[PDB]
Design a protein around this ligand. Structure first.
Ligand SMILES: Nc1ncnc2c1ncn2[C@H]1C[C@H](O)[C@@H](COP(=O)(O)OP(=O)(O)OP(=O)(O)O)O1
Ligand SMILES: [Mg+2]
Ligand code: NA
Ligand code: NA
Length: 300
DNA sequence: CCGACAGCGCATCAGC
DNA sequence: GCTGATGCGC
DNA sequence: GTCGG
């Protein structure tokens, strides 16, 4: 776009730090810089101009100058042609394979999806599912499909027990036209702070063949795979069982957005409770914590 | 100069 | 067998 | 990598 070349450069640098160098803080640093630049409504003419923005320091300013003068970045060019770094970076696209597993695989010659297929015994359950739905997991989910997925979830949950309260949060609740996955928050009157509710819900969704695979499952959090009945790509779905008195704080947090949660927290609010500067305050709705904006306007 | 940068649920490893 | 650390995703 | 004590 205006600075798409710069933001793509920073994003690519971010991924290298995360996946190859294992520098999570430098990763977030590049992303923060890429984020502020993407929102900047001017054609950047120099690194000095960008350095005025928060999150952009000397090193990135120098990289921008090189980019604006050459149209590329020498360091990135070398990284792209490097077999080891590129293979490590690519393997991290598989769900369940992080920087550690990726580096470990590449060390022993395993560099591609094909290599992963003929090495199945070297992969855990999560990684196998990640390999199986590699393409599907990188697909976006249209809102129309999300609506259909929501129809099934709310219907089956209410069938298990009409006392349940389920809310699909994330970008979908914010009214987005597409979503990366489905985040479902679940609660029940019999479950308050420190009081098999999640299991029965998961089982029912597996019974109607909505949930197809399981990445992780515990007493409060489920991570798995689902698919609409036909063809349809397999989708990532998370289900969290949350106490009733911590439910709406969770709804607020998991609704987002990222910038909104950060802004609302600064102006203590965490995913669980809200406390004065102290003991958790009684919250029975999203409006309550606001009193101490509709999801469609929660971008920042 | 130098520490913070989100924190936690679950799976699986490291070690006793 | 167990506890704690680590990896991972979010 | 950037920010700020
Ligand atoms: N780093 C974070 N800080 C605060 N809240 C976060 C963070 N990461 C995720 N969340 C919360 C806000 C999001 O709405 C909620 C769901 O995470 P996400 O699924 O990443 O939101 P999204 O659903 O808007 O992304 P997408 O549309 O790509 O799935 O989790
Ligand atoms: Mg989401
Ligand atoms: Na700056
Ligand atoms: Na991964």
């Amino acid at each position: 776009t205006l600075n798409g070349g710069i933001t793509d450069m920073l994003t690519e640098l971010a991924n290298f730090e995360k996946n190859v160098s294992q520098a999570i803080h430098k990763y977030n640093a590049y992303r923060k810089a890429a984020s502020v630049i993407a929102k900047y409504p001017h054609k950047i003419k120099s690194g000095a101009e960008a350095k005025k923005l928060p999150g952009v320091g000397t090193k990135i300013a120098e990289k921008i100058d090189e980019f604006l003068a050459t149209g590329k970045l020498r360091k990135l060019e070398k990284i792209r042609q490097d077999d080891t770094s590129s293979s490590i970076n690519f393997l991290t696209r598989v769900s369940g394979i992080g920087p550690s597993a990726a580096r470990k695989f590449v060390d022993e010659g395993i560099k591609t999806l094909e290599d992963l297929r003929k090495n199945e015994d070297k992969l855990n359950h999560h990684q196998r599912i990640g390999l199986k739905y590699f393409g599907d997991f990188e697909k976006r989910i249209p809102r129309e499909e999300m609506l259909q997925m929501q129809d099934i979830v709310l219907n089956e949950v209410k069938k298990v027990d009409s006392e349940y309260i389920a809310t699909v949060c994330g970008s979908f609740r914010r009214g987005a036209e597409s979503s990366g996955d489905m985040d479902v928050l679940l609660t029940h009157p019999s479950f308050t702070s420190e009081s098999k509710l999640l299991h029965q819900v998961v089982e029912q969704l597996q019974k109607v063949h909505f949930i197809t695979d399981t990445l992780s499952k515990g007493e409060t959090k489920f991570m798995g795979v689902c698919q609409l009945p036909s063809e349809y790509p397999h989708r990532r779905i998370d289900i969290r069982l949350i106490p009733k008195d911590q439910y709406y704080c969770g709804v607020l947090y998991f609704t987002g957005s990222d910038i909104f949660n950060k802004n609302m927290r600064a102006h203590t609010i965490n995913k669980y409770t809200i406390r004065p500067l102290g003991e958790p305050l009684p919250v029975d709705s999203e409006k309550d914590i606001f009193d101490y904006r509709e999801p469609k306007d929660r971008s920042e």
